[PDB]
């Protein structure tokens, strides 16, 4: 238009994009800083970074960009590109990013009274400590620290406005609890002037449904399947063939486990100690099976039974469980009869060893059942906010 | 040429690339916005982003770029680079991209009557919720929201033209249903002026052929192979050796399953519950086998059979299935005869236990056959648009 | 030098880098477009893109860059950077690239008669459909479509020169057949003027040596190893232990298979149906083995043999294969004799079941040998250009 | 403000951003260089690079940027963007980075007395040798070498200030020992002038908790589980079925091992030789088992025992371990009696072979127990700073 | 300073950064090109690219940048940024890079006599053929071809200086042999003028320690472990259970093999044929075992032995190996005696089949031992420079 052309030619005249737009040079320039969270992209435990989609919001008052609407009855707002008017240098302090800015400077909207508004959208990568001790029942607290790079409290004093979470697009894997802000002042031993900053703490909770369905169920099933070894009869030559195949399947399942579990060495994740306890239980099952088989295959050369060994496994442990011419012909045939009698005596004395082995199997079944139930329940129950996690996620 | 040189020297004189090219400053500038879809690149369920190849199309009318063709009888169109003439700032609102623009500003074609045309090609990355509850029989609805960044409805009012799908280059994995557009207006509690926008909804359907050939076939084959355990005779010492090897193969197959299934914790995908049901069936087969083997290896010390146990497995379940001097010589030889008689009696009483075990095996075969058929059919049939998916993809 | 300084100061005077360098403004500017292929980088079936190393070649005639050599007896050529002289905007239409250009604008060489030459080197990413139906015996046809972005046929008319393949640096995985070009004209219903373009079709053939050595050999070996089950004698309790271990090895081999086979759902690759047929054969071997073992372990309670079952497996199938006081003493000893006689009769009647099982094993060996030979030969032979692929690659 | 506008218009007048800001041109310009470490991102053994988050700090004195505060009673500091005032070109010499700079030039703060301050934040990628001989008990020494690119010691002489480690955000995987600095001078055979530089040596120690819990525990468990083979009785046909299944599980565990262990060929990592020793032990267990089984299944055709073989395994090795009409009737019945007697003699002579096999099993159990204990303890104990690593990490 | 300010204001006056800085325009400008190698980053066999860290070195003589030191007694060198003085356009011809330059133009140092020096550091990505026929005992020859983009031999003639390898930071995986240079001239059929270039050939040798410890050792161990099958006695039902478990472990080991071996189809790598020979040997072991077991389980219905079969396996092959009233009572008891006699005859005739099976096992052990020794030694020894590789790497 004919009016906004002369207004644009008038505004930029004798204008310097390096001076702070104030009227006295001794008064602070009030900048209202806010934030708008759009979504959470990824949370990396390897490099300890947090990727979010955030729209910043800045608003200050300029003094050299004021005009009377009466002389320009068709113009109410003007827009300037990046590098033609003064802009505050507020940027993320953490900013664990390659280019460190990730801001995409857009145009700057200015009203007719000098009130300037500016909101650059970008994807930020902050650096926060991730505590993985109670994985996967953990809760994180990551900080976003904004502030001016080279302006003090007497030149550009930051103010804070509540963050906006409208249009959050829930992540699905992480659940957002809230995002409060806080303004602080840092003093140096130079000048006795404040250095204000605005920090937003993003509090988020991990969802434990995918892990509880894809890691807990197969581990519990394999651990309970490993206990069937004691139920098998020793006559079938398939006891070790099951006891070691379960362990092989656990080893191949740890391959799927590995790609998920974090590799931090600061502490021991709860899922790691749970899987290690399960693995130790399955490992000791084979040793118990080996001892039971060493007791079942009793060669007929080691007596009947030691008194100390018998008096326990057949009287006390079995009580707790409630198991419960013609002369040559005569000499030729009585030898066969006595041979059969002696073989029957040998098999009768060797049957009790098999019965003791069955008793030992039942004892080990009870002991390992209570071991695995107690370990599996206790390890998961010991974690904090477990009841809150199951109540929110599962139910 | 001698004429277009002076025309170029004439057009840019007293021209400002920051003013909106209108003649009254109070009338809106009509901008016709369209879209051209070229292909769909990827659909990421991890970060919930959509990558597409899109050619935008913009068209407005300028006022300071008009010239009479008679004075320039060799020039009909002129082209200006980026940053020399006014261009609308229409850009994607979602734009889950690193640089947020991905536009590649090209030249701007202008006719001799001021009609300007401009179409920048680029690859866009929108952010949409992906609902994976019915994976792999799901249908998605992703939105592309375009609009002016800093112009109101009284300055730059958007119009919509139907999107073009000519030259679509079908993806192969995702099937496009359509892409309709809609223009909406958003009001603020400041000014009572519209803020128009143009949004395009991309509706696409997943193709279920690769999954139905590479995941369903091996799982069905393994599940049906696990049922052969009951058909085996108990004499061969190879029953557990098959029952647990099938489970080991299922565990190693879950490794291939894992890289495909999504990791979202918002809901349970249908393929996950189908594979979990198959795994539970294969797991319980081993427990049934253990009980059957515990019944086959009956030691000759526990009586013939309890009446309650016998009267079922041999009379009712077997009816439903329709299974159906010389004194010393005499004393020495009659002992052998009676020993043989007693051993034959013992083996005769122990044969019925094996027959009961065979009956139990047949019952478990029937029960597990109907269990696996019902589960496999029901889980897949319960999903919506399943008949549409199979009719379009397979047939 | 003293002369080229004044020549450079003379050429750029009153020069506009936006005007088309012609002398009448109504005559087309002839631009000769060529191409030089250096190597093929990658062919992606996931996103359907093609990455190549290409050196474009452009050549046109300028009019404002002419000088007489006599007045400058030391200067014959001059070079201008990007953005100081007019350059055609020829660029790839497909260009499935992030920045869409990938050109690296170099200097522009100009002769003393105005003949300008310019060749920018870059790495291009085109988008072409990849048909994977006959994988790995497939042949592709990918297109590279070049043309002016905003110039018509009456302003900038493209000409085509044959592509150069000198210095091709063969890929090793893909074999190049050729690269012919073609110039076409597209008409619009506006102006009745041509819109010329130049397109190059890159025809390439996949090399089938790595696949034929790393996928076909192990699959054939495993499939032929699975047939040894029928050769084993039934006395050894190791028949299922081999039949199911072969299947477990096939399942773990499919993990290596998975990372190679494409994931397109448009059609069924030939390697997928070949591996599926092999897997189905190995699966049915176990069912046949289960039936054979169910026939070998015949309990002595089911008669001798049904007439219909016997008359086939022992007369017809066996013919086709060409298998082929003292009273008490007497009562006490004749009982033992008759017991031995009856046990011998029972074992004699039970031997024929084992012989029938051996006959069934031989029949199944022949049937499965011909099944696997026919399937393996037919699936590979059915593909087109198979004889050409083996003749070129292997021999 | 009205004063800082004229101050900005005054400072840049007759100013050249290419001249070194001194007053005599023969005196060096003192530049104080420091460093601030924020975190360690990654340590790559593949390409031998180190990624860190570092905030440089530079401080020099300018001469043309001095003004009197009395004439500008509202201005105390001024800020200039990149490219408007002279800045030193100090940059990382190693800088194994794509763009080689990674600096993100910010504004430059200047006091009223000419004292200029400038601190650019960025992510650096240095190149250092990583010695992996004692993995995972290794300690590294990576260098960061800073210095001027094109200024000598008589123009820009570097000074060093102690690095700051406040706000270190511990990595979790690598433990920082310290970061001392040093200033050195390099002389050339041209000019006899120093070329100063500032180098910082980052000393870090690897944390051995994740490896000690996820690699040592399963390997020790599998190695000790492989020793149960000797404890098994030979009657059960399951000895090889365990001895080879343990080896199969070790082979599948090496897959998880592979993704962690480095691929450098300069030396042999300690974890590689430990896992190789474990694998060799498990391999030789099967050969010992094969020999034991070849001794257990003694066919009754090879005599009783060779004297040299017997006199050891039953007298010395067993002492060290402390194992410890009527004529036809008579001819018909005495033959049966003698046949039974001869069969009993044969089984009695064949029992001693089984006893010798048990003795051999016990000897091999003791020998392999001491072998595996000595190897496992010695390999880990031989590494340096092992006691320091366990004392700091575990306890 | 006061002098260098006027010197900088004097040098750039009437200066053009596009003219070649000579004094006659007909004389070539001598440019001395060198190179400095810092390290080798990666060698990719997939795309056939080579990534190196290289510092170029250029040096020419300018004519318009000369000043007398007496008039400027404080200035000896001046520095100009990129784009203010003329620089040669020497760049890598291969340059298989995205941006094709990767140079990071730094400042240009100039002496007081016009001697200009310039060395830009960068990371280059060349494209060279990698011959992988003798993997992992291969030696490569990759070329780096530098030259002027648009200057002939009569304008800018290149000279070559020997490359510098001081500070090489050895890679660890690749061993550098040397890097010689060569200057060549290319003539066109236009002008009869040279087009000089400078090319450096990087010769490097692969280190075979990691492969020789992580691939050769497990393959040899598994191959030698597979031979124990023949040593086992046939009485134990565990022969196939070992023969097929070894093959399963080999199949799972090929998964680790796959990620390392290249995927080029140009030729067959030596490691591929070695692993294939090992796999074929292990495969044929199972077939031999099946035949041996088919000979061990001889049913008592097929005669004693065919003469041709016996006369070899028991006379020749066993010689080469040096294996070596009362009437009813009488009728009732003589039947039992004759039954025992006939059963003893049957077992005596069936023992020789087992002995022949043992002889066959020993023959197959010898044959397969020599097969595997010859194959394993020959395949590795056939490669060139094998003795050099082992002498340098291992010893
Ligand atoms: C301008 O700022 C600089 C910042 O370093 C001041 O330099 C320091 O000033 C303090 C205050 O007296 C001294 O104690 C230090 O010794 C100074 N540092 C050095 C390296 O000399 C400088 O004094 C300030 N100038 C004015 C006029 O305020
Ligand atoms: C300016 O610097 C250049 C740097 O190369 C000097 O060139 C070398 O100077 C040494 C010193 O006499 C000679 O030995 C070499 O032969 C020169 N190199 C060449 C290629 O000629 C140059 O002399 C310096 N000029 C002045 C005036 O100091
Ligand atoms: C510069 O320094 C030198 C000695 O360092 C001195 O002789 C000379 O006078 C100084 N310059 C001025 C202008 O004082």
Author numbering:
A (entry chain E), B (entry chain D), C (entry chain C), D (entry chain A), E (entry chain B): 23 to 346, 432 to 502
Q: How do the authors describe this structure?
A:
Five identical subunits surround a central pore axis with 5-fold symmetry, forming a typical pentameric assembly. Each α7 subunit comprises an N-terminal extracellular domain (ECD), a C-terminal transmembrane domain (TMD) and an intracellular domain (ICD).
The narrowest point in the pore is located at L270 lying at the 9′ position in M2 helix, with a radius of ~1.4 Å, which is too narrow for the passage of a hydrated cation, suggesting a closed conformation of the channel. This is consistent with previous inference that the 9′-Leu gate, formed by side chains oriented towards the pore axis, is generally conserved in the Cys-loop receptor structures in α-bgt-bound closed states, as well as in apo-resting states. The apo-form structure of α7 has the narrowest ion channel with a radius of ~1.4 Å at 9′ position.
